[model samples]
Target: MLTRKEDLLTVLKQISALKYVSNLYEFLLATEKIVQTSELDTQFQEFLTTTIIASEQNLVENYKQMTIKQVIDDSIILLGNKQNYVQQIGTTTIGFYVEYRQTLYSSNFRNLLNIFGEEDFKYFLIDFLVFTKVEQNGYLQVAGVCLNQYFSVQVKQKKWYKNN
Candidate 1:
């Protein structure tokens, strides 16, 4: 029997939900209730907005037909070159750290540190919340990427418990 607080996942999903947001200040205002402050907020916000827009556009082109591979592949390709990808990831990483400072040790955030290999990992982490559209478990299943054990589950017993 599976049992833990469901609200934690809701909050995690809530944070991830911002992946689709287009504005920086709005995102900050929405997420600030959980935590506060990120110096690279603007950069990361732009990165998220750009990524989400590209993902949405790529999905739109699929009216004829599209595969999961196509969507994932095109989304990253839509992200631009390696340099652009790295810069955005770097900004996202730093901003993510600052925003979730209290939960730095949480596995949910730790799994997201994979900065090399497999372009899918990069897209998944950057679009962690957005990818949930193709997934059923919301951000947890998508955000966990290829990891066997989901980190958000572990976090369910840690920081989330502390907060609620």
Candidate 2:
């Protein structure tokens, strides 16, 4: 029998019991890998880091019990805004491209990050940036849809493929 997305989400919420730092560390790692391989350019990298830190810090400060969805949504909006900034500069960086296509979702990506250790987190982030950049350039629309769907699945269901 096929599992509903909401069922998956319930499972995810139940399984997830880590603290904030652990979650942040996981996200950092996942994001680092993706960004490393992608041709993000210095400015874009700085933008990403800054935005991530700012959003994370905000979460850390204001909300005592933020849901995964809230974190991911804020992160996505932040990244998307940064992408728009890069576009204005005429550089057409990968961050801009990915943000333009909307392939990078916070919830799915963050959940992936949460499963990793320190080393793995670093590796994943570098790879993620690269993958997203390449995917963005070659198949922006498709990639965007796929990522959005993935986020929807994750948000609605909670667990990823392996997590289930």
Candidate 3:
């Protein structure tokens, strides 16, 4: 988990510099989840220098297409793994991170409701599926996130597979 703004900035820079995802819609999912953590600053958005990166963050899709709900369920579960935390951020300037992410990913926002489904998108909005508290400046602060927060929502829907 991130405890200082500097580290968060580096992650944003790395996200921008690295040849991978979050360019919006496709990557906005990644950026949004990263920003929602705790204390990220929007300034990090400037780090994104390239329009397109080499790849995307992991979004587990089965060989055969599943219903929107099931797909989301599986993705969130997969995200819960400890290794899924591509980075630890969200202690300070977390909100600022959103701006950079939005501006960068906006160009890529699919804005389509045909495939991923609107309801599935909300699950992405949910935050703090995994986090840790750490000391910074003599106080404890919450940092980072793992797994987008769909596990609980899926449970609230009665935990029924192939339903809701």
Candidate 4:
């Protein structure tokens, strides 16, 4: 069975167990490579450093206790509002795009697309968006959200191939 095709909740558990991430550049690449696409390199890098990495660095009340989705969703909530959530991604406008087409969710969600928007390092949003899409096999057509553009994409491995 292909691992990437596995359920996102499961994959997220695995990513969490991954050894120390020394090369976020490649780490970010891993996010894309799985997705089968690429956006601005700096955008993903910034997201890795700021949102994901920074959030991981800061102690949450019980971060480890929370599921990955809960953690990321909480981060978006931290942005304070949809505007800041969508607007404040490192000075750049960015968004997530889902490819496979399944039950679209957050790219940070793994196996889907996840993001925010507009002009700047907002590219970081791209990181999670693409990464999650790579892991998923959601439908090609998705509903719309005005804030950030991409992410919370699709399904996973064996299951996705079946859909095609």
Candidate 5:
């Protein structure tokens, strides 16, 4: 979990910088390589930064108005750690800090699927698995695995290796 709000802000800023690149495709490719090399990389950092920057530039930044405490609280609620639903931060400029217990991984994964459903779960899994592979290999050279199709195919393919 992030202790300082500024650290989150810095991450958001870096993501914003990446999104501003003229060729987003190229930028994503490069970012993928960087993520592969850095096991600790979280792509959500880029998403948050880009989202905040765009909202700010558009003059509708919502996150900027939120206190660090509120941001953390909201993230906790979104992840279903609490039942109190308060939209403390209305601006899109808000960033997040997340915390989780490793023992609750399966439950959390199921809860996510319950909230976001299969398609979203597949996408999440693809992103997570890609990140894992990248961390191990230092880069992913292959492409063409769209989130929707990747999950089913990968699962079946892996089944054959289960008995081996």
Candidate 6:
């Protein structure tokens, strides 16, 4: 288990840096390949840097085969562990983490469905399944999955005039 917070933050730092890229699955694959090709004693941080640079250069192609739902079903391939966890972030950017053992009851699924609807819930569910599976203890942990909120909105100015 990765017992320190920095371990997870380091991973998130890469993800956040790549947040503008629409295809994250490619980033995952790029990192996997980087590590596999390197010799023993190579720095993992350098692997991240190379992957990020490769991705930004348009050298990495987005995953095109399976739908995200199919990948979610195959999450164990990426996660490499049996148990998983979830953390739901709401409009205020706050939420609590939960283990799959204790959650994923029908009630919770229904709530998620209501909140996300069919198409988006698939992405939401996969977010918990696919990304950031590094564990802190015996159990797997996901930092957070967020509720939909529009942070950027255009507002009309009063007095029938647009601001210059």
lDDT of 1 by residue, 38-154 (tens): 443454444333322112222212211133333333444444433333213323322123111222223322332322123443444344332211123222223212221233444
Reference-based TM-score of each model: 0.20, 0.20, 0.22, 0.22, 0.23, 0.26
Local distance difference test, per candidate? 0.31, 0.32, 0.30, 0.30, 0.28, 0.31
> Model 6, 63-121: lDDT tens per residue?
21133333233332332332222333221121222223223333433443443344444
Residue clash pairs of candidate 6: none
Cα lDDT for residue 70, candidate 4: 40
State how far residue 90 of model 5 sits from its true place (Å): 38
Candidate 1 global TM-score: 0.20
Q: lDDT: which candidate is best?
A: 2
* TM-score, cand. 5 vs. native: 0.23
lDDT of predicted model 1? 0.31
Question: Candidate 1, residue 131: CA error in Å?
Answer: 13
Q: List clashing residue pairs in candidate 5.
A: 12-49, 62-91, 62-92, 63-91, 63-92, 63-93, 63-94
Local accuracy of candidate 5 as per-residue lDDT tens digits, 1-164: 11233442343345432223122122333334223343322453342223211111221121111333332344343443322112211323223543331211333233433433444333322222111112322322111122223233334454454421
Sort by lDDT, best first: what order? 2, 6, 1, 3, 4, 5
What TM value does model 4 have?
Answer: 0.22
What local lDDT does model 4 show for residue 12?
34
